[PDB]
Amino acid sequence: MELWMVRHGETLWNREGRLLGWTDLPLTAEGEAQARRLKGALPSLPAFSSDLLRARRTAELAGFSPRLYPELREIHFGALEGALWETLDPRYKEALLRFQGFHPPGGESLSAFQERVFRFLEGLKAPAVLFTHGGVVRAVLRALGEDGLVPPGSAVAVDWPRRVLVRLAL
């Protein structure tokens, strides 16, 4: 199944290196511009979006009218929401870099997070554009053997559950 995964545009925390999960931060001005540049650049397929503001806004600016679904949310960082990456306890940093064995206090375990994400992908019947978050895009790419590092406001197409098709960074 062809699936376009769009990482929402820049927020102040994506810029200052602060963990951003369920905190409902808005896109920066540049983040909004990144979203606007996607309009007309992505296939006009049916759209689905995380319910968090920044994701919904990116969809809107990119010319879409997505159905809001919480399963597309970034992982919940719990007590570590907004936590500065610099001073993040080495154990969390390591776990987050390896993308495994990470369960932020009060947040979701990486296992529960990836389960709701892949469960959502399994429920899709026809190709679509998913306006989501960095951790979601990363989970998908990692499962596919490839790096899950794309920049904010960018999109990557994947033929789930097989491989990556194209990476769009404008």
Annotated binding site for substrate: 7-14, 54
CA 37 to chain centre: 18
Residue 156 φ/ψ, nearest 5 degrees: -140, 135
Residue 137 Cβ, how far from Cl ion at the closest point, in Å? 8
- The single-letter DSSP state of residue 18 is B
Residue 74 Cβ, how far from Cl ion at the closest point, in Å? 6
Stretch that binds Cl ion, among 21-29, 37-45, 115-123, 129-137 (CB under 5 A): 129-137
Instruction: Give SS3 for 98.
Output: helix
Q: Which of 57/133 has CB closer to Cl ion?
A: 133
Residue 126 Cβ, how far from Cl ion at the closest point, in Å? 26
Residue 133 in the binding site for Cl ion (CB under 5 A): yes
Q: 5 - beta bridge partners?
A: 130, 156
Query: Has 74 been annotated as catalytic?
Result: yes
Instruction: Please choose, from the candidates 129, 145, 142, the residue with its C-alpha nearest in 3D space to the C-alpha of residue 49.
Output: 129
Residue 134 in the binding site for Cl ion (CB under 5 A): yes
74, 81, 108, 133: the catalytic one is: 74
Q: Please tell me the distance from the alpha carbon of residue 55 to that of residue 78, in angstroms, as a whole number.
A: 19
Catalytic site positions: 8, 74
Q: By CB under 5 A, name the binding residues for Cl ion.
A: 133-134
